[PDB]
Amino acid sequence: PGSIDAISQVINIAKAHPNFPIALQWTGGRGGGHHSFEDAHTPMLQMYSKIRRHPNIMLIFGS
Amino acid sequence: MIENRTMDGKPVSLPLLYNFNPDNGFAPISEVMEDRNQRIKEMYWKLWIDEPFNLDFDPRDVIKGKDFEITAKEVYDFTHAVGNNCEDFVSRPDRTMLAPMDFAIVVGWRAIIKAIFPNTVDGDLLKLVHLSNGYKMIPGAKPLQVGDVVSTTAVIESVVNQPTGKIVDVVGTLSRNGKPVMEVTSSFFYRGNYTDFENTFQKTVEPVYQMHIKTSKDIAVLRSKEWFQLDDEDFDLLNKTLTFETETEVTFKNANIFSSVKCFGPIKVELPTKETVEIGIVDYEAGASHGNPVVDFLKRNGSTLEQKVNLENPIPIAVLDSYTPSTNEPYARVSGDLNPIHVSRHFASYANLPGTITHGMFSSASVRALIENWAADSVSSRVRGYTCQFVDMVLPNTALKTSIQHVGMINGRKLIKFETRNEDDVVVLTGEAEIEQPVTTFVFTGQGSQEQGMGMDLYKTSKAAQDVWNRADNHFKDTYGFSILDIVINNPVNLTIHFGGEKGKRIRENYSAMIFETIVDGKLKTEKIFKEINEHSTSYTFRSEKGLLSATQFTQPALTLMEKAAFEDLKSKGLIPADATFAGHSLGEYAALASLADVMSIESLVEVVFYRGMTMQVAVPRDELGRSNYGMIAINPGRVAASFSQEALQYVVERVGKRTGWLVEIVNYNVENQQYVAAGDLRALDTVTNVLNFIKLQKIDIIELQKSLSLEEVEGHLFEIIDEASKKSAVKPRPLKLERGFACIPLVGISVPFHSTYLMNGVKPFKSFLKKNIIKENVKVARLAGKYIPNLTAKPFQVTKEYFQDVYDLTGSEPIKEIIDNWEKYEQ
Amino acid sequence: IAKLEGAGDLALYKDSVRENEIVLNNYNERVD
Amino acid sequence: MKPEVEQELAHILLTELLAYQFASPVRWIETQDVFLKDFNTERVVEIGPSPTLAGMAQRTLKNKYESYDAALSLHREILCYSKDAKEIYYTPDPIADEPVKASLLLHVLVAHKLKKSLDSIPMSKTIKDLVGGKSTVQNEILGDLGKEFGTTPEKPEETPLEELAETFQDTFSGALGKQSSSLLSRLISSKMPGGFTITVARKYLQTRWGLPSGRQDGVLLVALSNEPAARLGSEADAKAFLDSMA
Amino acid sequence: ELIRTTLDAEKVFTQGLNILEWLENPSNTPDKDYLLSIPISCPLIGVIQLAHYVVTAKLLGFTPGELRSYLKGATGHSQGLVTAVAIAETDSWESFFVSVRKAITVLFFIGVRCYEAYPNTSLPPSILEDSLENNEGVPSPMLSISNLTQEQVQDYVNKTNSHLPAGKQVEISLVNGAKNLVVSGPPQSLYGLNLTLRKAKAPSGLDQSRIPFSERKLKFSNRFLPVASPFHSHLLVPASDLINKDLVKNNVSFNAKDIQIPVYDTFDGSDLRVLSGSISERIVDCIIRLPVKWETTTQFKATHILDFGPGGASGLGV
C-alpha cells in the first residue's frame, strides 16, 4: 500500500481471511523506482496500532 | 407585619390595624383607613431613607441627597449582582475603573424615591408601580469613574391625577466637580382614585427649539404673538437663527382643563461668530386653558437641534437570553431597594402580586448590559442614553428573551430599540438606547480615479446629492457657461463656451479676470490665463484627446463634488458624528472643509477648485503642444533595498538637485518606507530612477557606508553615481518619455510639479482668489479646532501662537508674520 | 475556485483540478 | 481671546493653509500618525471614488501599529465609501422502486443526533466541524456510522459528509441495518401513530402515493429528521404528517 | 457554611450553593452560565469525582481505605490533584467526610480567589461571530491545539507574544500529548493566535494526496475549551498567596505520614509524599502557576488505570 487509505484496505483483507498470512510491505516515497508522495514514518505511527490488531498481518518495512 | 431584611438588621414592623365589630356579623372585620397611608410610608422610610422621618415638605421644592464617593468595592459588587461582565468595570493597571450608568440609581435612589413621600402626594406605597426608568448623559460629560464624589439633586417634574391613578415623574441630576453628569428619570404610579387637583402640577423644561427666519411673513407672525417680548423692539430678525430655551409650569383644576399655564425662557440669536446672545424673553401666562400655545407654535414653525431619521429597514442585532436570579436579595443589597415585595413572600401576598417579583431595575440593568455588549462593541462610554418601560412583572428563575434592533440614527448616534419576552411569549420590558458610533476620522481622496458617470448613481437616488450637483451645475452655467454634469455624464472631447448676449458678456468677464504668476527669466509676471479671450471674443474652445473629464480643471471640481455629495447624503441619513476628525489628501482638503466645517458654500467650493485646476495647468511652460518638461514618479524605498529608508531618499534626491541644478523634490509622504512621490524636471526624475536602478543591482547600502565608514566621502561616492546617469539623461529628446525601474513608477497624466517649491511663485493670485470666496463670517472655529488635520502642517488645526509660528517656518507669509509680531490681540 | 477568485491556497485548488483532468483523460481513453 | 478675533485669525490661518498647500509637500505619514495614534481612531471612512487612502491606512496600521493596537485592545475599521457602503449606511441584504442513497441516510443519522433540521446541516462540512465543542457527540456519531455502514475510513471526522457519503455508497446497498431500523422503531412507537405500527404505516404510503420498499424507507428517514416531538391526536393527523414527509 | 465564614463570598455566590435544591427541584436550578463559572464549578467537579469513588467503593462492599490499598498510586490533571491527595488519606466511612471536607474547602478557595484575580469579561461580538464561523469555539482563556508538536505550537506563540505586552502574553499551559496542547492567556490574545493558525492550516476539502509530503499544509484542530479561567498561567499568580492564607485560617494541611499511596505531582512527575515544604502550597502552585506535563506525570508503570473524572468517553481516561 502507498497511502493510509491503502493500509486500511489491507487490514480489511486480513480481517476477511483471519488465518491467511499477509505480508504488508510498507514503503515510503523515498524508495527507488515508482514511488508515492508519502513519508516513511508518519503513516506507520498513525496505522501501526490498527495493523497489530490483526495477528495474520506480518509487517515489513522497506525504502 | 415584619421585615427582617433592613438597613441595620434591627427588624422593621408595619402595624396594619383592623376594627372587629361583632354587631355586624356578615362582615365583622373592617380595615382602619385613617393614617393607613402614613403607617405604610413610615415603614418604607426606615427601609429606604437614612434621615429623621417627616412627610411635611413641599413637592415643588428641590430634594438633595448625600455626596456619594464611588469605590471599586461598590462597583465590583453592583456588576456581579446585575451580570455586567464588560472590561471597563474590572480593575486593571494604568486605565481607571469606570462605573456603569446603571450605577446612577444607586447614587440617586435616596433622593429620587424621597419625591413620592410628601403628605400632598398621598398613596398606598404597597400598590406603587415603577412604570419607566431612564438615563441620559449630558453631552460632552465623561462617564462615572471610581474616585469621583457625586452630588445628587432630584426634582418632581409632573404629579398628574389620571382616571386609573396618580403618575409621579421625577428627574434626578448627578453632578461631579460642580457640573451635571447625567439625568435619571423615573415615573411612578399610585393605583387609586385621586381628586387632589390642588396638589397636582407639571413643571417641565421643554427641548430647545430653533427658527430660521427666512421670509417677512415669518417675522410678521412672531410680532403678532404677545408672548415674544424683545429687549430692542426695532431689532432685525431677517436671515437670523433664533433658539427658544423655554420651561412651562402648569397647575390643574380638572383631569383635562389647566388652572394656569406659564411658558417662559430666554430667546437667543446666533451671531456671525456663532456665540449666542439673549435678545428676548417668552412671557406667556393664562387662566383656565386646554393647552400651551407657545410650544404648539415652536413645534410646527420651528425644529429641534437634533432630528432622528429611521433606517429604511430595521436591522436585527441579536436575540439574547438573560435569566433573572433565584433570589432578589443580592440586587437589593447593592441598590438599597429593600422594598419588601421583592424579598418577603408575605408582603408580596398582601400586595396581590404573583410571588416575590424581580426588581424592575434588575431587569433594566441586565438588558442594558446586553445592549452595551452587542451595540457598543462592549465600550461603556458609547451608551449615551437608555430608557426602559416596565410592562409586566417577572418572577425569579425566568428565561427572558430580548430582541435588539438598530432602528434609526440621530446626529451620529445609533437609535437602538429592544423588547424582552418571557417563556409564555409576553412583553415584560421595552426601551430605547442612544449609542455613539466608534471614534471616527473622515479622509477625502485627491486626484486619480476620474471615471465617466462618477457619483451619478448617488445623484439618481439621493435628494441631498441632487442639491449639491444641481447647485454647482447652475453656478458653473451662469459663471463659466458650461454644465459640470454634462462633462461628468458624457465626457466630451471638445467644449466651446460662447460669449453671446447679456449673460455671455458676464461669463466672458469671469474668464478675463483669472490671472496667474510665473517666473519669466527676470521677475514675477502677472498674466491672464486664457490669453486668447479678450472683449472682442465670442467663443472659447477647451480641447483634449481622450475626454475633458481627464483635464484637471474639470476633474478637480467633479472629484470634489462627488465627495461633497457622498458626504451630504451620509449627513442627511444622520450618520455623521459631531466630534469627527477629518483630513484630505491634496485636493481632498477642499471637499473635507466644505463638508465638515461649512467654510465655503457649494458655489464658492467649485469656483476655487476650478481656478486651482487652472493655475496647475499654466504654471509650467508647455510650448510644444499639451507636453511639458516636468512630471512625477512614485518611489517604493522598501523595494530598492531592505535598509533603504526615508533618510536615504531625503539625501539622494536633495543631492541630485544640489548637483545637477535641476529641480527635483519629494512632494507626497504617503506610506512610511513604502510610498513616496517625487516631482520635478523629467531629466532629474530620469537620474533618480537610474541612481535607484544602480543601488538595487550594486547593493551598496548608504547607511552602512555613510557616517559609519566614510565622512563627507558619501558626497564623493554619490556625485560619481549621479554624473554617469545625469549626463546620460541630458541627451534625450527635448520632451523625454520617462520609463520605470524596479523602485520607481511614473504617474501617467501628471505634467506639473504641484506640492513642490516650483509653484511657490503662483500663490499670490490663488491666495487673493480664496479671500473673495472664503468669507470670515462663514468660519466657525469650534468646527475646525482639534478636528481638521491640514497637509501643510500635519498638526490638528489650532488658533494659538505656536501653530502660526510653525506655519511661517514652512511658508514665509507676511500676513502671518505680522500677527505673531503683535500676538497681543488678547486685548480685543 | 469561483468563491476564492471572487476576491496561496488557490494555486493548490487549481493543480488539484489539473491533476483530476490527467486521471479523467485516462478514464475516457479507457471508455474509447 | 474674544470670539470675534479668534474667528478673524482662524480665517487668516485657514486661507494661508489652503493657499500654500499646493506649494509644500503633503505630509500624509505624519497625518495618519495623528489620527491613528493621538486620537485612537477606531474607524477611518475614506470618502472618494476609489479606495486609495484606505489601502494606505491598512498598510500603515500593519507596518507600525500591530504592537500599539494589541496593547490597547483597539479593534480598527478601514472603510471606503465606494466599496463598503453597506457597512457605512447600515443597510445589509438578508412509481419506480430505488434503494436509498448513503448520501440521504448519512445526512439523516447526523441530523437526528444533533437535534437539527435536514437542511440546517450542509453536506460540505466535517463531523468535527458540526459538533466541534462537545467531543462526546462526535464519537457517538462515529459509533452510529460504525453500526450503520460497518467499515469506516481513517479519521472520518476530518472528511466532509459529502465526500464521506461516496466512500460508503460503494460497499453499501440500500440497507437500513442496525442503527436506523432501531431509530424508526422508536420514532413510530414513542410518537403517537397511536395504534398503527410500521406495517400499517408502510402500506398507507404504498397504497395512497404508490411507493414500494426502497422509496418507502426514504420517506420514513425524512420523518425521523422532521420529528413531530409534540403529542398528535389521531391517524387523521399522522396521515397528514406522512403526506408532508413524502 | 463556607460562604458565611468567608468575608465577602455572598457577593460572588449570588444564587448560593444549595446543590440539594438544584438536583431535587431541577427548575429552581441556576442557569448554565453561572454553573460554569470557576467559583461554583471547581468545588462541584470535586463532588462528582468523590461521588464516583463512593458508588465505586460501596458496590464493591469496600470502605474507602480498602479501595486505596489496592491502588498502587493516584494522580490528577489540573484541579483533580486535590481529589487525588484526599483519596490517599481516607481510611473508614466516618473519617472519610473529614477528607472530603478538606478537598472541597481547598477547591472552594482556588475557585473564589482565582475569579477575583482574573475575571472573564465580555468579548466584542465581532470576535465571537468570527470564532463560531471558523469553527473555533466561543472564546475563553484556554485554547486546545490538536495535532501539532509542542515545538511547532511554541513557534506560533513566540510570533504572537512578540506584538503583546507582558501581562497579555499567552503560554503553553497543559502538554497533554506529544501532539495535544492547551494554551492559556487572555481570550483577546488567544484570538490573535487563532489568526496566525488560520494562515497555516489546510482547507478540509482539498485532497493533498498528490503533493510531496514536506510541502503539505499541516492538517490540525484548534478549539477554545469550555472553562472560564486561565489555569496554569502567570495571570493567576496574585491568587497563589491569598489561597495559602485561607487554608491556614480553615486549618487545612495535608501531611506526608497521613497519605498512604504515592500521589504524582503534575509538573515534575515525582511523589508529593517526598517534600520539604507544605503539600497544600505545592498542589495550589500546580493548578494556579505551573504547567501540566502529563507525559512525565503518567510515567508510572501499571496494567490498569481508573478514570473517576468527569466526561467519561470525552474525559481524561480516553
Which terms summarize this structure?
part of a larger assembly, 5 chains, A: 63 residues, alpha+beta, two-stranded parallel ribbon, 2 helices, 38% helix, 19% strand, elongated, D: 246 residues, mainly alpha, UDP-galactose 4-epimerase, domain 1, 2 domains, two-stranded parallel sheet, 13 helices, 3 strands, 57% helix, Fatty acid synthase subunit beta (chain A), Translation machinery-associated protein 17 (chain C), Fatty acid synthase subunit alpha (chain D)
Description:
It is classed as transferase. Keywords: Fatty acid synthase, Acyl carrier protein, Ketosynthase, Ketoreductase, Enoyl reductase, Dehydratase, Malonyl/palmitoyl transferase, Phosphopantetheine transferase, transferase. The structure is cut from a larger assembly and holds 3 copies of chain A, 1 copy of chain C (32 residues) and 1 copy of chain D (246 residues). Chain A is an alpha+beta fold. In chain A, 38% of the residues lie in helices and 19% in strands. With 32 residues, chain C is mainly alpha-helical. Chain C is elongated. Chain C starts with a helix and ends with a helix. Chain D is mostly helical. A two-stranded parallel ribbon of chain D has the order 2-3. At the A-D interface, helix 1 and helix 2 of A face loops of D. Strand 31 (664-671) of chain B pairs parallel with strand 1 of chain D.
